[PDB]
Amino acid sequence: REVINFNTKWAFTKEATEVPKEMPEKWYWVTLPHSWNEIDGQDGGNDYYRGTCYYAKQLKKSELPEADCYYLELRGANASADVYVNGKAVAHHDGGYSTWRVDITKELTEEENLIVIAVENGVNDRVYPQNADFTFYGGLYRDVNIIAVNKSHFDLDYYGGPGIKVTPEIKGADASVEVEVFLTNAAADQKLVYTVKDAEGKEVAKTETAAGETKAVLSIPAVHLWNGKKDPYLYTAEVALVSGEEAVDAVSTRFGCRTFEIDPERGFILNGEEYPLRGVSRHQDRWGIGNALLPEHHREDIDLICELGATTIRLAHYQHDQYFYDLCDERGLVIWAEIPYISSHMPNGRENTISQMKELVVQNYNHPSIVVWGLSNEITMEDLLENHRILNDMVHEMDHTRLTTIAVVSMCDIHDPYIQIPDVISYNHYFGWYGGDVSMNGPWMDNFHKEFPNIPLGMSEYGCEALNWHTSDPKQGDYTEEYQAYYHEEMIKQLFTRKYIWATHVWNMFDFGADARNEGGENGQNHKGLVTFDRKYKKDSFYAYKAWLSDEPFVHLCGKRYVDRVEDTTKVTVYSNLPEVELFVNGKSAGKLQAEDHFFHFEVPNVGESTLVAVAGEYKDESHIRKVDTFNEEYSLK
């Protein structure tokens, strides 16, 4: 079994109205990952190009390996896509966030075969998402592969799944692992070899059945538990299909062995031990390249998330890339995954919710980092309830090892009956950013918990917009770095001290692309990130969370970009996971503070040009301010 990368140099246009009969010669050349909205969907006006575009590329049999079957594998085509080979329709897909495949073998008539793929991201009442606060970046934004396999092979045609499914039960200090596989055109002549390898490639269990016995239970004694960031231990199930003595096809996945519970009062439980889920959400895009992410971009996103110290990520609002989920497995992050069933219930979208959800569970069942499947987000912003029951029952029938969840819009009456459908729920609240006061958040959650004490309640969104604006009068709607620091300061104090809230997710870890937005001085993005869209600047609110969640010791001065201050006595905030901070102004000491909540609020003289140095143990940070007569108007959006 060989996987041939098929990314290089496709022909591309928006300007075509029929599949071309022969390879286009005047189209634009792209190499995948590619989106045609990387610019016009990150800059405002809600005007990014939505419609049908064409990708063409020749497949040459001469350049292919010898095998009995050839699959086209698409890891992401947003949103709807039509595959052609030599002018003939061979596959159609709705769902921009999941893998799908088509055997093209019988169509490779020639030595030079024309693959046309049409991708459409327009408006319809049929394919989710249709209404949401993010760009539906069009195109082949994830890899396209060719898969050459033997006539008999592990299944490639069931909802883009790996062809292999792994389920551990923890029995004491051992574990039994069910490794089920799926085959296409097998012969009872053939055998199957199930192997589990440990972290060292060292074979720890093996067994051999017939090709008609497509399931096996292996034992793993003294099992190393997948225990989050403490020890994200991954095994590897591998299964070979052997014709006589020759392994003729194989497949594999990593997997972790753990148990978990989501307790209405104790919060999240991991392998029998409380393991609070405090974390962030992440969109799969980046400034300048739309959603056409490279492996390095995924690596960098999880690195920064790891530096902050999150224990959970909510991967909203759709299926993310398999590599990103793998990273979550290796690092021991606890993941919420969901489908883009969002904002506004479309009665004709029922089919597309079921097929994206099926794809989400089948393709992601083996990732030990995933614990909840999300049915919908803000969907109320009876047909709706049926759509939810159907999804809730299908997930519970596909996956006995995980629970279901929803994210609820802020205004939804808590007695809405759809809240009673999933196993757990979370609310998306913006008290103190979009209306209200930040102090309202704790009392709201408490009130829900009193009313529904046996429903585990999380916070799946909360956030506050921030760009390079500054003030000594931080308020809701000024968009300043300083007001956003305070908002997260207050949210951390309220939420991180409520054990019953089973998971919190900052909205959002990064600024992200949303072409309909036109606010804050920079249009086409949501600026509720802790980090900017290009991942180059970490806002002060990043270091408030780090102070609570990282054990790596640090000290961070807030306000570095706020230099020209008017007041004679200015406020200087310092974050540190160390217990005591001392701040110096021009070598003169403005006092010592011990903040057990890690937020050190100093009052400091503002005269002339001053350098500030905060000192906590062996660690230090440094910033500078300047006294001025008038507010530096560059600091102000208004």
Ligand X SMILES: Cc1cc2nc3c(=O)[nH]c(=O)nc-3n(C[C@H](O)[C@H](O)[C@H](O)COP(=O)(O)O)c2cc1C
Contact status: 73 vs ligand X (CB under 6 A): no
Please give the torsion angle defined by the CA atoms of residues 19, 23, 26 and 28, in that order, rounded to the nearest 10 degrees.
80
How far, in Å, CA of 548 to CA of 596, rounded? 10
How far, in Å, CA of 373 to CA of 360, rounded? 9
* Among residues 4, 13, 19, 40, the one that binds Ca ion under rule CB under 5 A: 40
- CA count, 13 A, side-chain hemisphere, 111: 2
Contact status: 362 vs ligand X (CB under 6 A): yes
- Least distance in Å: CB of 160 to ligand X? 9
Name the helix (H) or strand (E) containing 236.
strand 235-243
**Helix then strand then coil, % of the chain, to nearest 5:** 20, 35, 45
Q: Which is nearer to a second copy, 53 or 251 (CB)?
A: 53
* Among residues 122, 124, 158, 619, the one that binds ligand X under rule CB under 6 A: 158
Q: Can you point out the beta strands (E) in 529-594?
A: 555-557, 564-565, 569-576, 580-585, 588-594
* Among residues 13, 19, 20, 43, the one that binds Ca ion under rule CB under 5 A: 43
Q: Which of residues 46-65 bind Ca ion (CB under 5 A)?
A: 47-48
Q: Which residue has the tokens 């301010």?
A: 625
Q: Which is nearer to a second copy, 18 or 552 (CB)?
A: 18
User: How far is CA 399 from each of CA 155, 332, 392, 393, rounded to the nearest angstrom?
Assistant: 19, 21, 11, 10
Residue nearest to ligand X (CB): 158
Q: Which does 633 bind (CB under 5 to 8 A by kind): Ca ion, ligand X, a second copy, none?
A: none
Contact status: 45 vs Ca ion (CB under 5 A): yes
Which residues make up the interface to a second copy (CB under 8 A)? 8-9, 12-18, 22, 25-31, 36, 38-40, 43, 49-52, 82, 88-89, 91-92, 118, 120, 122-126, 157, 347-348, 350-351, 354, 358, 382-383, 390, 394
- Least distance in Å: CB of 637 to ligand X? 41
Contact status: 71 vs ligand X (CB under 6 A): no
How far, in Å, CA of 73 to CA of 101, rounded? 5
- Least distance in Å: CB of 21 to ligand X? 4
Q: Which of residues 515-544 bind Ca ion (CB under 5 A)?
A: 515
Q: Which is nearer to a second copy, 383 or 580 (CB)?
A: 383
Contact status: 9 vs ligand X (CB under 6 A): no
- Give the gyration radius of the chain's Cα atoms: 26
Active site residue 481: no
Q: Which does 390 bind (CB under 5 to 8 A by kind): Ca ion, ligand X, a second copy, none?
A: a second copy
Contact status: 461 vs Ca ion (CB under 5 A): no
How far, in Å, CA of 611 to CA of 585, rounded? 6
How far, in Å, CA of 344 to CA of 380, rounded? 6
612 by Cβ neighbours in 10 Å (0-12 / 13-18 / 19+) ranks as buried
Q: Which of 38, 338, 359, 378 is catalytic?
A: 378
Chain residues that interact with Ca ion, rule: CB under 5 A: 40, 43, 45, 47-48, 515
Chain residues that interact with ligand X, rule: CB under 6 A: 21, 87, 155, 158, 161, 163, 165, 182, 358, 361-362, 365, 394, 398-399
Residues recognised as catalytic? 378
